RNA sequence: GAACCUCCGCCCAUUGCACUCCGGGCGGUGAAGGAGAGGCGCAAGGUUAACCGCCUCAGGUUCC
């Protein structure tokens, strides 16, 4: 019904500072999120449609859940992070589960 | 082995759920001057312009 609240390998963060550059944003996200588990990948775009947002993809769903709870609202580049679970599996995960396309 | 990046900014608009990239406008620096190198296009065309795209490579960084 509301998939953004059902745990997922991938967390969706928005309300990020759009001023920060793509690579710096990716590496700072990794720095703050890697202690919660192994990170398959972190996807950021500076597109009009995708700026201010990032998908952080964990190997273990339990890792996503701990990262979200612990970093909900956390100040990051002067804006409180807003964290959800991704509404659908990231492609790399769909490939693992055998569900891709 | 993989991913991301590789000239420096300003303003306007945007709170947006992607996984092939992709809003608009304006400046500056550098003559060891198209932005790490090569190739190939494309651009440019003299007091000081062009500043881009693709592919390969290199490096930096984060990982496996
Ligand atoms: N090394 C070369 O083969 C070479 C380097 C630089 C120059 C050159 C210019 C070349 C082309 C230009 N336009 C097409 C407008 C302008 C150039 O401007 C300069 C300016 C200066 N200054 C000392 C101010 C030096 C060299 C320039 C060339 C060239 O053929 O002129 C070749
Ligand atoms: O193709 C490289 C890869 O197969 C293996 N290698 C090197 N470093 C690696 C790593 O950090 N992770 C993984 N998974 N695999 C790695 O070695 C091959 C060659 O790499 P080198 O840069 O060492 O090449 P060299 O010519 O020096 O032997
Ligand atoms: N190297 C060089 C310096 C300056 C100029 N110039 O025209 O001013 C030209 C060259 N060149 O190589 O032709
Ligand atoms: Mg260039
Ligand atoms: Mg470049």
Author numbering: 2 to 102
The authors write:
The fluorescent light-up aptamer RhoBAST, which binds and activates the fluorophore–quencher conjugate tetramethylrhodamine-dinitroaniline with high affinity, super high brightness, remarkable photostability, and fast exchange kinetics, exhibits excellent performance in super-resolution RNA imaging. FLAPs are in vitro selected RNA sequences that bind and dramatically enhance the fluorescence of fluorogenic ligands which are cell-permeable and exogeneous to the biological system. RhoBAST was specifically optimized from its parental sequence, SRB-2, which was originally selected against sulforhodamine B. biRhoBAST and o-Coral can be regarded as dimeric variants of RhoBAST and SRB-2, respectively. It is suggested that RhoBAST could activate different rhodamine-based ligands, such as the tetramethylrhodamine-dinitroaniline (TMR-DN) and spirocyclic rhodamine (SpyRho)32, via the CQ and SP mechanisms, respectively, which display super high brightness, high binding affinity (KD ~ 30 nM), enhanced photostability and faster exchange kinetics than other FLAP systems under the same condition.
To facilitate crystallization and phasing, the L2′ or L3′ of RhoBAST were initially replaced with the U1 RNA hairpin loop, resulting in two constructs of L2′-U1 and L3′-U1, respectively. The space group is I212121, and each asymmetrical unit contains three complexes. However, the electron density for the DN moiety of TMR-DN is missing in two of them, likely due to the flexibility of the linker connecting the fluorophore and quencher. Interestingly, the RhoBAST folds into an asymmetric “A”-like architecture, which is organized with a four-way rather than the previously predicted three-way junction consisting of three A-form helices (updated as P1, P2, and P4) and one short pseudo-helix P3 connected by three loops (updated as L2, L3, and L4). The L3 and L4 loops interact extensively, which stabilizes the “A”-like architecture and creates a binding platform for the fluorophore ligand at the tip of the “A”-like structure. The nucleobases of G35 within L3 and C52 within L4 flip out from their residing loops and position into the major grooves of their counterparts (i.e., L4 and L3, respectively), forming two interwoven canonical WC base pairs, G35–C43 and G31–C52, respectively. Furthermore, two Mg2+ ions can be identified to cooperatively coordinate with two couples of adjacent phosphate moieties around the helices interfaces, such as C8-Mg2+1-G37 (holding P2 and P4) and A36-Mg2+2-C53 (holding P3 and P4).
